[PDB]
Write a protein that binds this ligand. Structure first.
Ligand SMILES: Cn1c(=O)oc2cc(N)ccc21
Ligand SMILES: [Mn+2]
Ligand SMILES: [Mn+2]
Lengths: 137, 137
């Protein structure tokens, strides 16, 4: 039986800017680095950056909607978004759903998000206003 | 301050086989399904499957090393991997470069992994058998 997410691995084209982004800009904890990658943590999340010459710096119009959302409190959301904006981090989508969300790109174009709110919060909102075709279990 | 992964969203090309894969084959908990997506959980992980006409079925030689690993116990690992094998689930990697792992593909070619062990355990193993140039913080 699967018990959770063990780790997220992002392929990166250049290790140093990716470490700077996740550790310094985003505040994640750097535990180890080697010639071709790094291990960081963000709360329970184990993040691996893996240096990969096959990683393309990918414009957001050229990638699908796969994305990775990090938790932040409502109280901290606006100042973290402003930090990303000060650093010139590009936004790939505006929020139109429940709960605050900021949609931003990493140096290689990985699609990231800051989100406030749990699955339980989302399901409660959907119960009251279900999406088209929505069934609950 | 970022506190972990809020959710993982995978773009899918065909919703029904993707729901079946994550719910029926992998055993995750299906909470809701609508015309364009589904919400599942795997332990504390919130997984969203999002129907995306941009998603392409991607062979593993065409994608980079970005991947998503799920936790499984030492007692369950081998039989779960063998069941995926017997079910014809495609693979993408054989060499265990990061411990006890099974590397497999979802219906769209998302790179998945079963892994036994925590980040702390991987750091301890790496101290004995470090990756080239490895530094520990
Ligand atoms: C089979 N099935 C299900 O369990 O929930 C559904 C929802 C939709 N929209 C379409 C099909 C299903
Ligand atoms: Mn999202
Ligand atoms: Mn892995």
């Amino acid at each position: 039986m699967l018990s959770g997410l063990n780790h997220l691995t992002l392929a990166v084209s250049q290790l140093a800017p990716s470490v700077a982004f996740y550790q310094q800009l985003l505040g994640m904890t750097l535990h180890a680095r080697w010639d071709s990658g790094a291990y960081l943590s963000c709360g329970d999340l184990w993040l691996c950056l893996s240096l990969d010459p096959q990683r393309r710096v990918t414009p957001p119009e050229e990638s699908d909607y796969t994305h990775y959302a990090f938790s932040i409190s409502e109280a901290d959301f606006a100042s973290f978004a402003a930090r990303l904006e000060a650093a010139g981090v590009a936004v790939w989508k505006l929020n139109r759903s429940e709960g605050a969300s900021h949609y931003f790109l990493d140096p290689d174009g990985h699609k990231l998000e800051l989100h406030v709110g749990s699955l339980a919060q989302r399901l409660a909102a959907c119960r009251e206003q279900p999406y088209k075709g929505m069934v609950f279990f």
